[PDB]
Design a protein around this ligand. Sequence first.
Ligand SMILES: *[C@@H]1O[C@H](CO)[C@@H](O)[C@H](O)[C@H]1NC(C)=O
Ligand SMILES: *[C@@H]1O[C@H](CO)[C@@H](O)[C@H](O)[C@H]1NC(C)=O
Ligand SMILES: *[C@@H]1O[C@H](CO)[C@@H](O)[C@H](O)[C@H]1NC(C)=O
Ligand SMILES: *[C@@H]1O[C@H](CO)[C@@H](O)[C@H](O)[C@H]1NC(C)=O
Ligand SMILES: *[C@@H]1O[C@H](CO)[C@@H](O)[C@H](O)[C@H]1NC(C)=O
Ligand SMILES: CC(=O)N1CCC[C@H]1C(=O)O
Ligand SMILES: CC(=O)N1CCC[C@H]1C(=O)O
Ligand SMILES: CC(=O)N1CCC[C@H]1C(=O)O
Ligand SMILES: CC(=O)N1CCC[C@H]1C(=O)O
Ligand SMILES: CC(=O)N1CCC[C@H]1C(=O)O
Ligand SMILES: [Ca+2]
Ligand SMILES: [Ca+2]
Ligand SMILES: [Ca+2]
Ligand SMILES: [Ca+2]
Ligand SMILES: [Ca+2]
Ligand SMILES: [Ca+2]
Ligand SMILES: [Ca+2]
Ligand SMILES: [Ca+2]
Ligand SMILES: [Ca+2]
Ligand SMILES: [Ca+2]
Lengths: 204, 204, 204, 204, 204
Amino acid sequence: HTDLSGKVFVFPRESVTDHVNLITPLEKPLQNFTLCFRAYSDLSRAYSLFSYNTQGRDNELLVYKERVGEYSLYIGRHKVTSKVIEKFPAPVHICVSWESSSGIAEFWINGTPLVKKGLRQGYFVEAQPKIVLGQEQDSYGGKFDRSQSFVGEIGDLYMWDSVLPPENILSAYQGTPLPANILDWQALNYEIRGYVIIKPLVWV
Amino acid sequence: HTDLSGKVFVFPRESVTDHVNLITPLEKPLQNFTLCFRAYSDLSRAYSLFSYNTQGRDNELLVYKERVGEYSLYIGRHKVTSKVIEKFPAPVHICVSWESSSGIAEFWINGTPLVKKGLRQGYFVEAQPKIVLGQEQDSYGGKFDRSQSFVGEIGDLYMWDSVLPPENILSAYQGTPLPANILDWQALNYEIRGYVIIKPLVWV
Amino acid sequence: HTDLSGKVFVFPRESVTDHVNLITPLEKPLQNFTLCFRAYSDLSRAYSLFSYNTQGRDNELLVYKERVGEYSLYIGRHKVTSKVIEKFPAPVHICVSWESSSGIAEFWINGTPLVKKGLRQGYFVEAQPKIVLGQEQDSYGGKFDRSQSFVGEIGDLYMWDSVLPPENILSAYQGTPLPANILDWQALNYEIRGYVIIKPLVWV
Amino acid sequence: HTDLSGKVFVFPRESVTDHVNLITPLEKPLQNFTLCFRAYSDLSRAYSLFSYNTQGRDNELLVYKERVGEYSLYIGRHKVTSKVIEKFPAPVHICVSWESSSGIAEFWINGTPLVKKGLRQGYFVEAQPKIVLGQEQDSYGGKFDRSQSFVGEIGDLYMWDSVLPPENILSAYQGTPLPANILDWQALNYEIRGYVIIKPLVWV
Amino acid sequence: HTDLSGKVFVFPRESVTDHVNLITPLEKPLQNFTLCFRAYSDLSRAYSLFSYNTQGRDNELLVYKERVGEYSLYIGRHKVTSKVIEKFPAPVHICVSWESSSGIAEFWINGTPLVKKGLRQGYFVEAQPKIVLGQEQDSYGGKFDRSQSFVGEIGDLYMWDSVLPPENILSAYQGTPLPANILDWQALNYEIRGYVIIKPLVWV
Ligand SMILES: *[C@@H]1O[C@H](CO)[C@@H](O)[C@H](O)[C@H]1NC(C)=O
Ligand SMILES: *[C@@H]1O[C@H](CO)[C@@H](O)[C@H](O)[C@H]1NC(C)=O
Ligand SMILES: *[C@@H]1O[C@H](CO)[C@@H](O)[C@H](O)[C@H]1NC(C)=O
Ligand SMILES: *[C@@H]1O[C@H](CO)[C@@H](O)[C@H](O)[C@H]1NC(C)=O
Ligand SMILES: *[C@@H]1O[C@H](CO)[C@@H](O)[C@H](O)[C@H]1NC(C)=O
Ligand SMILES: CC(=O)N1CCC[C@H]1C(=O)O
Ligand SMILES: CC(=O)N1CCC[C@H]1C(=O)O
Ligand SMILES: CC(=O)N1CCC[C@H]1C(=O)O
Ligand SMILES: CC(=O)N1CCC[C@H]1C(=O)O
Ligand SMILES: CC(=O)N1CCC[C@H]1C(=O)O
Ligand SMILES: [Ca+2]
Ligand SMILES: [Ca+2]
Ligand SMILES: [Ca+2]
Ligand SMILES: [Ca+2]
Ligand SMILES: [Ca+2]
Ligand SMILES: [Ca+2]
Ligand SMILES: [Ca+2]
Ligand SMILES: [Ca+2]
Ligand SMILES: [Ca+2]
Ligand SMILES: [Ca+2]
């Protein structure tokens, strides 16, 4: 595993090939999670931010940007979307959490909460995922689509098996995240495929 | 009754099913009232914020959001509408009062007064209501319409049988409302139907 | 006469009936005047703010709002219009002066001077007027038009038989007008007709 | 012959007649000049700000406002135009200089330099002008065009037979110009023709 | 050579003739570079900012502005483009770096980083260039196009044979650039052709 403190993945061009695989030792289905990261892109078309598929299951956990100001979460193929005022282009800090017991999904953009939405109450997100940055999966680990590819920079990614309270979301946004047990930027197990370059983070 | 201080109702999806019934021992017709609450929604279509119907009478007291920047009050089916500059999406604090003797309706949005309008001078709002959050009634307690449903979060709801002066409206906006004798968020009698979740208020 | 300090006239609906007549013992033709008042309306269509007609003479002195950002003064049917950057909807303080000797008309909006214009140099505004708020006159006291009616609130109205200097306009904008000898909000002789309600001024 | 400190010319209406003739006793061709003045107009159509014609020569020196945000200088019938971000309507302070040796024209708007442009390198602006405010000349002292007329206010006009450096431009903008040798607001020889009124400057 | 500190090149008109040749003793192909400069133009159409061609190679290194808010870099005829929020017209400070080993191109506009893009990984930029300001080259030193010409002012140009870190980019932006070994504004060898004038820098 690798300490990526102070660094970003750069996906420097549009492709159907360039991606990073993220490896987690996650064998138990998820009832609760929070995912935070920073991104900087000047794409106006739609793109995937974080794609988690399991065997036989597309869009098992997907964070997707449909257009400026609109963020979508998919859980087990079902989707919710919330809106925010944002400048374009601009760096962003994105957190999203989901809680099975209520179905509530919370997006937080630059430390501000979006309107709560709900989906998949009682569901468990399936384990043994393939997790990809830079492309949107339609199969278990593949079937990418360049019109959904992420071109730009991603850093400071964390995933926890709990729903972070507001104080811990703000801490992540400020740069003092709680250590994370599913994915953690200070100890990330990743595989680069194609043209992805690791560079210093210069925009936070 | 339940003290919902620090909490909101979350209406997490569009539906014709999800709603909260609010119960108040209102047996005398209303001459004067003030209603305040906070709301956070990213709907662009029209929606009902507060629906009060009586037997045989639709839109006896209705607070309805036509579109961004436009707030309507219905009293006994008659309507007025006033406009305001607001960001979208954004949390809002809404107060509205009405006084039978003058017919004057006063909206206050985030502590700022809208232009006064007038309707139903001399009328008394009928008693024994069904009061619904989340859906717009067309019958006594029912006949909801998905395209008028509220999706988002509502909290800090208070209703008085008097017209509040500006200083008391500001107190409510600031989080220290005067005690309210029709509906009180700190002693609320309600019934959840369908998918409505109580969560902490994180956006004020 | 009545002291309306701290109060407004509310014209709560569109109509061809609702108006206030202002009474002044003006028997000598006017060579110079200044008129100040505050208004709050969310109409987008054209409307009359102050209508002064004399026997046989329509639009003898008329302050008219054709559209957002544009204020007109008519003197003996002739008009000038000046433009301003303003928010909509928003309360406004409006002063206008005119001087026969030069023909110069000065609008001040929220204490800011508009571009000077000129009309009717050498003319005298005729005496023995009927002065109306809420409607635009087409006869001596009447012939109103619903599509020109004022809906909203007017207060702090003063009229002087001289051209106020800038620092006196500012004093009026700040809520401390100098003594006024044609119309005076603190000793106003008026008649309400139709649906007009006096309420506290809550927006200044 | 007159000190206009604290005063403006008001051109109160559109016409093909109303203007001020400015008379300089300096009689010499111009190789270098700077011209500064303040203006306030709410016209959206094109208009002339300063028109200098010589016998048989149109547009010998012309400062012309094509549309909002665009200022043009003509030297000997040739033109340059530069752009600026400005609010509309708004008072403005305009300086423009031109240097024959380089051909460079410099506009400064409210103390801010526009992009330099170049024209007529080596040319001498002809002597013995008619200089007009309020109208655009097409002949020596005449052939005006109502659609190019200036409506509004002009004050604080100075013209020097040198190119002012930035510090002197700022001094003029701030109300402390260096004494000027072609035209000077504090010792101005002018002739009003038609409807032009001198009033105090109330907008700076 | 010449210290152009405090000065700019002014390209005062649209033309196919006016340009500056920049002379560098660069005989080894470039693997890494950073280029900074300040520009002020009110063109809305596309234009070239910095044109570097070699014998037999068009667009070997080209910095091009297609439209407001979009900056392009060509390396060996391949292009990348990144977007930024910017006012128009407005002075701008532009830096761009490129590193062959990763292919990463970094634009910085007014000291803020744009999204990184990548092109020509492993390529060497050809040596023995002709470098032109004011025009876009289509041959080795020539074949200009009026519709791509730069009209406006350029100064503070530096080019280094390395990729500058953020602190050194900010130093350039703030007016204390590090000495630069390919091109240096403080020791510049240049040739003016046509109508280009050197003037003080008045807009920084
Ligand atoms: C899921 O998260 C919620 C909110 O923090 C918490 O109340 C609950 O205990 C969590 N459930 C599990 C199984 O961890
Ligand atoms: C409603 O308000 C009016 C006007 O102030 C007041 O006179 C009246 O008593 C009020 N009605 C009730 C039932 O309190
Ligand atoms: C109107 O104003 C002018 C100029 O100030 C003055 O000369 C004249 O006397 C005034 N007319 C009156 C007071 O009726
Ligand atoms: C013209 O420009 C400047 C002074 O503004 C100066 O360098 C030059 O000598 C001037 N020439 C004349 C004719 O005064
Ligand atoms: C280009 O930059 C990289 C930065 O690490 C460096 O390793 C390489 O030597 C550079 N090439 C040259 C020719 O300096
Ligand atoms: C097909 C579908 O539902 N979605 C959601 C966004 C990505 C897209 C996809 O899986 O390609
Ligand atoms: C029909 C009508 O007047 N109204 C008012 C707003 C919603 C709508 C309704 O009751 O459905
Ligand atoms: C006819 C006319 O000139 N005007 C001016 C504005 C009101 C309108 C009117 O008198 O009805
Ligand atoms: C004809 C021409 O070139 N111009 C310049 C602006 C005014 C206009 C004119 O002289 O009327
Ligand atoms: C032809 C081409 O590829 N380009 C790139 C920008 C300018 C333009 C050119 O060389 O003219
Ligand atoms: Ca998919
Ligand atoms: Ca897909
Ligand atoms: Ca209804
Ligand atoms: Ca309905
Ligand atoms: Ca009329
Ligand atoms: Ca009329
Ligand atoms: Ca002309
Ligand atoms: Ca002309
Ligand atoms: Ca080329
Ligand atoms: Ca070309």
